Amino acid sequence: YQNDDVRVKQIKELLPPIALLEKFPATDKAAFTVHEARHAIHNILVGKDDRLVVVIGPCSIHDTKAALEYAERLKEIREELKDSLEIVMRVYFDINEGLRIARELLLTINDQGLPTAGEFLDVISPQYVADLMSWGAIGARTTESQIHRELASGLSCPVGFKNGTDGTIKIAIDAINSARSAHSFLSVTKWGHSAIVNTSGNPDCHIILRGGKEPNYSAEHVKAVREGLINAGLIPSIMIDFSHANSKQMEVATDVSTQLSQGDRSITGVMIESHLCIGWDDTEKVLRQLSEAVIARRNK
Amino acid sequence: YQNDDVRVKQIKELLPPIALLEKFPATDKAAFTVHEARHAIHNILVGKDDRLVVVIGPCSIHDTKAALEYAERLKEIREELKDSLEIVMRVYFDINEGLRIARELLLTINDQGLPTAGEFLDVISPQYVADLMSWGAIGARTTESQIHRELASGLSCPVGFKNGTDGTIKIAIDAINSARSAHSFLSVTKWGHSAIVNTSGNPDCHIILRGGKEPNYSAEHVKAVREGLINAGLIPSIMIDFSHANSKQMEVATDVSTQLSQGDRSITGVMIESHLCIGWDDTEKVLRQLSEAVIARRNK
Amino acid sequence: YQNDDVRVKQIKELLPPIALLEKFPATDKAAFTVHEARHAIHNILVGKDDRLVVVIGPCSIHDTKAALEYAERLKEIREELKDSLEIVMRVYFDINEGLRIARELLLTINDQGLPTAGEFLDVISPQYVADLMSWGAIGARTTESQIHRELASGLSCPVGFKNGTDGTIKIAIDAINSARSAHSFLSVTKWGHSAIVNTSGNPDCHIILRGGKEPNYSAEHVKAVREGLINAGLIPSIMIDFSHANSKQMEVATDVSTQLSQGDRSITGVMIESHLCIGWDDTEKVLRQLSEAVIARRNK
Amino acid sequence: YQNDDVRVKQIKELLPPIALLEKFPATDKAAFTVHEARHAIHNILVGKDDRLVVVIGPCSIHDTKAALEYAERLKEIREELKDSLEIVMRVYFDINEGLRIARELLLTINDQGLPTAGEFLDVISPQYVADLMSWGAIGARTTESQIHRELASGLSCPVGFKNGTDGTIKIAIDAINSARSAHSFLSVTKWGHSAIVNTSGNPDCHIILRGGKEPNYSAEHVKAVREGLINAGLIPSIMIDFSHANSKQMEVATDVSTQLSQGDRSITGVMIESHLCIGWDDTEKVLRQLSEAVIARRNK
Ligand SMILES: N[C@@H](Cc1ccccc1)C(=O)O
Ligand SMILES: N[C@@H](Cc1ccccc1)C(=O)O
Ligand SMILES: N[C@@H](Cc1ccccc1)C(=O)O
Ligand SMILES: N[C@@H](Cc1ccccc1)C(=O)O
């Protein structure tokens, strides 16, 4: 009797992580950009830094030429607005070729002094690119998954838990709470071998408001989230996704810029989808608006 | 700057799956029990067999001897009631030692002609035990998770998607729908190496009703689930968990036995938590009650 | 251009050593037999013990029941003659199946309290069986080989270097000299992965006289070997192979028994080829003769 | 008790070959140089091509800048003398760093259109570099060794067996004979995992005359070698090492150039040891003299 693998069409060796690290090692400059962006984001999350984190990028990378072009531009705005914003580029996507393309893109962008952000959707894919990642998001459909909370608990970067697809806040609050503890999960070593990973716990996790069944970017939605975080004993540190089920992106940015201007220190990050999705012209516009809002927040 | 593994306390090689298969190979009898229990469950799920699937076991295995003792008893009742019930034992839990204990327990129970059922929480631990598994659940917290639906799509056994922790049915309906397609995910080979797994799709998935905010086992909840499956184009095949957030387990069994007696052919399985959690005396009682209900279902 | 593997017909993963150790772990009795036999052989090689080492077995194992039967008999003579002889059974041979058969045979024989001896032809297959090996030979054709001297340098058991196929003594003297230093060589971990092995050096290496252009077992050959070891600064500890190019095995045994009787404390081991190659009756005869020779050696 | 690895100070994972191939892939130009040099060497060995193979290089590479400089010069002489000589550079050597340095050096040299030659001491390190190797030697100490003959049997390039350290010709003749059969040996996959390698047999193996107790390069030694190859049914194709125990290098070159001039078609290759060991000025003199000898061989 064939009981084994009756539903597997094919199972093929993946390059071990070490193969991608050898082919595409972090420069000293990449390694620094990553280290600095992770510290900066930590400082912003806890309120030691009054700047806003801004994860902004394409909906997805289809063409690496276009991404590198976007990165050159965004880099200049990262430099100019570095006193009001900490800008990080969202980079979202033969699987071996896919991994080579991905790591190489990430390395190049970090090596130009632009930190990068991604989506952690599995427990094996971080072993190939997390050394080039300054921030990651766990999806709304994986925020209650124990292995995804356990993964967060052992990641070197800060992490955002999206709320559930129906607006549920509690799963993210529990996710953040869980991710701060030590845990165990199964994945592979750098050498590609099945492994037990024991984590130390990650204090740098926070909620992402991405809509749900009702846009959660309102001041009262933000007020209710903040209070739910405070009750649970967590830092009231909140990132608002302008895209996805919050839509229109320009109207969200106006509404959020308001709250920042009124003096809401609880809103510590935002996410924006931006292409060469709003256009590049509108991307600059919104960034300058949020910048203005942060500076006004310093005062009022 | 040390960017790698800043939150990993320890990472150690796990035994490759091949090490546990070599130490604890399936006997011809184990292999048969597994193959036959998976076919039988398939036939029950589609309505070709009018027997009920019954996944019944401890809340968790704390002590293998107690489990082996429970298995000896349950086996005799599996044999006696086999014309009305297909009884499968729920087996739930140094990680290397843990894996040796688990596989050895599973092998012994299957080798005694008692099929076993598990819970898949990750994409790596199936490689160690799935060949001894006649059925598995995806938990309420992972039913919406892409990687878990992809896993289901490539598992050799039937799979139950629990509804969400708040009673939400839709995620299971979508899960079943997704699990029937071919998919890709990352895990390891039998040899323990990082891998791409390409799946062929699994038609043998069904919902599990486990409660949510309020219990969801009553005839009107079952009626609304059935209609929700039918509208989505799926076989109205429903398993009811008597435990968890449906509680009291004896009252659920009474209520369900009723519906089976009334002639509900759409209820094709149940789950029960039972120790040496209800006692052995009450475990036999409930099994005989469901058996009676199935017999009465034959007649009308 | 296809430059890679043009002359490899096929390359297939071998079971990692850990798979054979998990399937066939050393019993407490195996582990002890091995530990004690290796210490005893050490003591005999250095002159602290006045018994003779006797490596005796089939030309090769073709049939494991015949080997197990041979082992039962040899074991009784090991027990009876243990005051004069340290008897060790020579155990020489789908490669995965071959490895399972080999380890299982070795484990059974050691678990019955009969230590085993092998031949190291390569640097990878020790990882599968060395933990059950109380002694090993490097063959005449590899005694000069750097990789084999390096392997000897890192093995847990005593090792014999056969002289060259033409009678050359110096390669063995240099082999002993080399094997006692620390070295490095490439092979695999228990987990099956390519590896660097750093060795501590093995002082428990000695020459084996097997013949050459003409037999080399007589008192004059032994005298010149002893003097060649002394001049090189090494312990005059000599093992004489009764078989191979020394033939007459019994005539060799008579001649060697003589030298032992006359009081030659430099002859510390012998090799005998013995089947169910001399017969079982002649195997007992020779063992009792050497026993007698050891006893008589005590008295002079 | 503690029977495993009592003489292993440390054992560490080595980069899998795939990590070095991914970091330092063969360019199109490297791959071609290798393909062409291996075919050319084949043609010279069998007598289809009346040029001489010349393996010439440093005693060993300590400094890669000096090697690259040597390679640039040798390359110009490879190009100029290509009608009379097929010139190949001898390239001999944290082992992970060592492997990176080695592969990178070899890749650079082949990518400049200069084929490279090495020395096979083990069965694992070919997986890292053999794809950049146009030719290799088995040394005098391993020519008789079974695993080395088996390795030769599965290598993609031609191979030379040196005669034994005492002048013995027969081991090389037997080595050639054995290397042309299919064999099995243990080593790793490109992925770094323990493996069985099944070979197809390598007809492109030949003797290397490297001395012994007395030099073996004169016409009468060559005559006796040739006749020993002929009687064994083998192509009388002979390579003469000018170095090692043949010394003086310039006197050997004179004597050999003679035999080539007198019309000896059986001498198909030579080895020379050369750094910027004879000097660069003397390296050109012998190459041009051998060139002249080849040209004279063409005529009478
Ligand atoms: N390498 C990850 C942690 C990790 C290890 C192993 C598996 C998965 C994730 C990091 O440095 O963030
Ligand atoms: N072995 C699983 C399928 C699988 C393969 C590889 C990784 C994970 C899962 C089954 O038979 O159900
Ligand atoms: N396992 C061998 C040492 C060894 C390790 C690795 C490769 C080869 C040999 C011994 O214990 O004696
Ligand atoms: N890769 C070698 C052959 C080889 C394979 C595996 C192990 C060792 C050697 C060659 O191509 O010539």
Could you write out the DSSP letters of every residue in chain B? ---SSTTEEEEEEPPPHHHHHHHSPPPHHHHHHHHHHHHHHHHHHHTSS-SEEEEEE-SS-S-HHHHHHHHHHHHHHHHHTTTTEEEEEE----HHHHHHHHHHHHHHHHHTT--EEEE--SSSTHHHHGGG-SEEEE-TTTTT-HHHHHHHHT-SS-EEEEPPTT---HHHHHHHHHHTS--EEEEE-TTSBEEEEEE---S-EEEEE---SS---SHHHHHHHHHHHHHTT----EEEESSGGG--HHHHHHHHHHHHHHT-TTEEEEEEEB---B-HHHHHHHHHHHHHHHHHHHH-
Closest CA to D139 of D115, D116, D165: D165
* Count of positions (residues) in chain B: 300
The residue written with tokens 């990692």 in the block is C16
Q: Pairing mode, if any, of strands C238-241 and C205-209? A: parallel
As given in the structure block, the two tokens for residue D75 are 């390359």
Look up the CATH number of the domain holding residue A67: 3.20.20.70
Nearest-Cα residue of chain C relative to residue B100: C22
Q: Are C257 and C227 in contact (CB under 8 A)?
A: no
Across the interface, of B16, B34, B182, the residue whose CB is closest to A194 is B16
Contacts with A, C 163-222, CB within 8 Å: 191, 193
Q: Pairing mode, if any, of strands B194-199 and B184-188? A: antiparallel
Ligand 3 centre to CA of C103 (Å) is 15
Ligand 1 centre to CA of A115 (Å) is 18
Give residue ranges with CB within 6 A of ligand 3.
C 123, 126-127, 130, 154-156, 187, 197; D 4-5, 8
CB within 8 A of C294, min separation 6: which ones? C50, C51, C52, C84, C85, C260
Q: Is the CB of D197 under 6 A from ligand 4?
A: yes
Q: Are C195 and D14 in contact (CB under 8 A)?
A: yes
Domain-embedded: residue C4: no
As given in the structure block, the two tokens for residue D223 are 């005559």
Residue type for position C131: D
What whole-number distance in Å separates Cα of residue B136 and Cα of residue B117? 5
Q: What is the DSSP letter of A75?
A: H
Ligand 4 centre to CA of D83 (Å) is 31
Closest CA to B252 of B270, B279, B230, B275: B270
Q: What is the DSSP letter of C163?
A: P
Across the interface, of C14, C147, C182, the residue whose CB is closest to D9 is C182
Residue C11's DSSP bridge partners are D197
Q: Is the CB of C13 under 6 A from ligand 4?
A: no
* Count of positions (residues) in chain D: 300
What whole-number distance in Å separates Cα of residue D122 and Cα of residue C122? 10
Contact D8 C198 (CB under 8 A): yes
Ligand 2 centre to CA of B196 (Å) is 11
- As a whole number of angstroms, the longest Cα–Cα distance in chain B is 74
User: What residue ranges in chain A does DSSP mark as E strands?
Assistant: 8-13, 52-57, 85-90, 116-119, 135-138, 159-162, 184-188, 194-199, 205-209, 238-241, 267-273
CB environment D107-123: b (16+ within 10 A), e (fewer) = bbbbbeebbbbbbbbbb
Residue A56's DSSP bridge partners are A89, A272
Give the 3-state secondary structure of residue C189.
coil
What whole-number distance in Å separates Cα of residue B154 and Cα of residue A7? 5
How many Cα atoms occupy the beta-carbon half-sphere of D164 within 13 Å?
20
How many Cα atoms occupy the beta-carbon half-sphere of D127 within 13 Å?
26
Contact C154 D193 (CB under 8 A): no
As given in the structure block, the two tokens for residue C226 are 């002893």
Cβ atoms within 10 Å, residue A214: 11
Angle at A123 between CA A118 and CA A128, to 5 degrees: 60
Q: What's the domain range around A44?
A: 17-299
What whole-number distance in Å separates Cα of residue D208 and Cα of residue D270? 8
Q: Is the CB of B4 under 6 A from ligand 1?
A: yes
What whole-number distance in Å separates Cα of residue C79 and Cα of residue C67? 18
> In Å, how far are B83, B208, B300 from B291, measured between CA atoms?
9, 20, 15
Cβ atoms within 10 Å, residue D77: 18
> In Å, how far are A113, A141, C54, C142 from C270, measured between CA atoms?
72, 72, 5, 20
Whether residue B13 lies within 8 A of chain C, CB to CB, comes out as yes
What whole-number distance in Å separates Cα of residue C12 and Cα of residue C100? 17
Whether residue B107 lies within 8 A of chain C, CB to CB, comes out as no
Measured in angstroms, the CA of D165 and the nearest CA of chain C are apart by: 10
Q: Are A27 and A131 in contact (CB under 8 A)?
A: no
Partners of residue B107 in chain C, C-beta under 8 Å? none
Across the interface, of B13, B22, B100, the residue whose CB is closest to C19 is B22
> In Å, how far are A184, B48, B151, D113 from A122, measured between CA atoms?
15, 38, 12, 45
Q: In what order do the strands lie in the sheet with A184-188?
A: A184-188, A194-199, B8-13
Provide φ and ψ at D280, rounded to 5°: -60, -40
Q: Pairing mode, if any, of strands B159-162 and A116-119? A: unpaired
Partners of residue B23 in chain C, C-beta under 8 Å? 19, 22-23
Ligand 4 centre to CA of D266 (Å) is 29
What whole-number distance in Å separates Cα of residue C104 and Cα of residue C71? 14
- As a whole number of angstroms, the longest Cα–Cα distance in chain D is 74
What whole-number distance in Å separates Cα of residue C147 and Cα of residue B104? 41
Of ligand 4's atoms, which has the minimum distance to the CA of residue D127?
A: 1
What whole-number distance in Å separates Cα of residue C165 and Cα of residue D156? 30
- As a whole number of angstroms, the longest Cα–Cα distance in chain A is 74
What whole-number distance in Å separates Cα of residue B77 and Cα of residue B60? 20
Give the 3-state secondary structure of residue C24.
coil
Measured in angstroms, the CA of A19 and the nearest CA of chain D are apart by: 4
Helix (H) or strand (E) holding C270: strand C267-273
Helix (H) or strand (E) holding D118: strand D116-119
Instruction: Dump the DSSP string for A246-291.
Output: G--HHHHHHHHHHHHHHT-TTEEEEEEEB---B-HHHHHHHHHHHH
Q: Pairing mode, if any, of strands A194-199 and A184-188? A: antiparallel
Angle at B167 between CA B164 and CA B169, to 5 degrees: 70
What whole-number distance in Å separates Cα of residue B116 and Cα of residue B242? 18
Cβ atoms within 10 Å, residue B289: 17
Ligand 3 centre to CA of C183 (Å) is 13
Q: Is the CB of D187 under 6 A from ligand 4?
A: yes
> In Å, how far are A143, A204, B9, B38, B150 from A177, measured between CA atoms?
12, 11, 19, 39, 27
**Measured in Å, how far apart are chain C's first and last C-alpha atoms?**
74
Partners of residue B131 in chain A, C-beta under 8 Å? 3-4
Domain-embedded: residue D3: no
From its phi and psi, is residue D196 left (phi > 0), alpha (psi between -120 and 50) or beta?
A: beta
Ligand 2 centre to CA of B127 (Å) is 5
Of ligand 4's atoms, which has the minimum distance to the CA of residue C3?
A: 11
Ligand 3 centre to CA of C179 (Å) is 14
* Count of positions (residues) in chain C: 300
Provide φ and ψ at A46, rounded to 5°: -85, -10
Taking the CA atoms of chain B, what radius of gyration do you get in angstroms? 19
| Virtual torsion, Cα A25, A29, A32, A34, nearest 10 deg | -60
Percent helix, strand and coil across chain D, each to the nearest 5: 45, 20, 35
Q: Are D78 and D87 in contact (CB under 8 A)?
A: yes
Q: Pairing mode, if any, of strands C85-90 and C159-162? A: unpaired
Ligand 4 centre to CA of A14 (Å) is 21
Q: Is the CB of A156 under 6 A from ligand 1?
A: yes
Of ligand 4's atoms, which has the minimum distance to the CA of residue C4?
A: 11
Q: Is the CB of B115 under 6 A from ligand 2?
A: no
Size of interface A-C (CB pairs under 8 A): 3
Domain-embedded: residue B1: no
Q: What is the DSSP letter of A193?
A: B
Residue C10's DSSP bridge partners are D198
Closest CA to C291 of C79, C130, C122: C79
Measured in angstroms, the CA of D257 and the nearest CA of chain C are apart by: 33
Contact B147 A142 (CB under 8 A): yes
Partners of residue A22 in chain D, C-beta under 8 Å? 15, 19-20, 22-23
Provide φ and ψ at A231, rounded to 5°: -50, -40
Domain-embedded: residue C189: yes
Number of folded domains that form chain C = 1
From its phi and psi, is residue C238 left (phi > 0), alpha (psi between -120 and 50) or beta?
A: beta
Whether residue A96 lies within 8 A of chain D, CB to CB, comes out as no
Q: In what order do the strands lie in the sheet with D184-188?
A: C8-13, D194-199, D184-188
Give the 3-state secondary structure of residue D261.
helix
Residue A55's DSSP bridge partners are A88, A271
As given in the structure block, the two tokens for residue A235 are 């830092």
Partners of residue C191 in chain B, C-beta under 8 Å? 13, 16, 192
Helix (H) or strand (E) holding A17: helix A17-23
Domain-embedded: residue B186: yes
Taking the CA atoms of chain C, what radius of gyration do you get in angstroms? 19
Residue type for position C195: A
CB environment B133-161: b (16+ within 10 A), e (fewer) = bbbbbbbbbbbbbbbbbbbbbbbbbbbbb
What whole-number distance in Å separates Cα of residue D253 and Cα of residue D265? 16
Residue type for position B218: S
Q: Is the CB of D156 under 6 A from ligand 4?
A: yes
Whether residue B27 lies within 8 A of chain A, CB to CB, comes out as no
Method used for this model? X-ray
Provide φ and ψ at A275, rounded to 5°: -120, 165
As given in the structure block, the two tokens for residue D169 are 């010709």
Give the 3-state secondary structure of residue C159.
strand
Contacts with A, B 131-160, CB within 8 Å: 131, 141-142, 144-148, 153-156
CB within 8 A of C146, min separation 6: which ones? D121, D141, D142
What whole-number distance in Å separates Cα of residue C128 and Cα of residue D185? 15
Q: Are C77 and C111 in contact (CB under 8 A)?
A: no
The residue written with tokens 């030579």 in the block is D270
Closest protein CA for atom 11 of ligand 1: B5
Whether residue B23 lies within 8 A of chain C, CB to CB, comes out as yes
Domain-embedded: residue D272: yes
As given in the structure block, the two tokens for residue A4 are 């084994």
What whole-number distance in Å separates Cα of residue C194 and Cα of residue D192? 5
| Virtual torsion, Cα C24, C30, C36, C40, nearest 10 deg | -80
Q: Are A253 and A293 in contact (CB under 8 A)?
A: no
Ligand nearest to the CA of D155: 4
Partners of residue B197 in chain A, C-beta under 8 Å? 8, 10-11
Provide φ and ψ at C153, rounded to 5°: -60, -25
Closest CA to D190 of B57, A256, A192: A192
Q: Is the CB of A21 under 6 A from ligand 1?
A: no
| Packing angle, helices C219-231 and C249-262, rounded to 10 | 60
Whether residue C12 lies within 8 A of chain A, CB to CB, comes out as no
Q: Is the CB of B197 under 6 A from ligand 2?
A: yes
Angle at A42 between CA A39 and CA A43, to 5 degrees: 90
Helical segments of chain D, H only: 17-23, 28-46, 64-80, 95-111, 126-129, 146-153, 170-179, 219-231, 249-262, 280-299
**Torsion sign (Cα): C176, C181, C185, C187:** positive
What whole-number distance in Å separates Cα of residue C187 and Cα of residue C16? 12
Of ligand 1's atoms, which has the minimum distance to the CA of residue A155?
A: 12
As given in the structure block, the two tokens for residue A69 are 């072009």
Domain-embedded: residue C123: yes
> In Å, how far are A60, A223, A246, A276 from A250, measured between CA atoms?
20, 21, 11, 17
Measured in angstroms, the CA of A12 and the nearest CA of chain B are apart by: 5
Give the 3-state secondary structure of residue C147.
helix
For residue C116, with 0-12 CB atoms within 10 Å meaning exposed, 13-18 middle and 19 or more buried, which class applies? Answer: buried
CB within 8 A of B225, min separation 6: which ones? B169, B207, B209, B216, B238
Domain-embedded: residue B51: yes
CB within 8 A of A185, min separation 6: which ones? A123, A147, A150, A151, A154, A196, A197, A199, B122
Across the interface, of C13, C22, C191, the residue whose CB is closest to B22 is C22
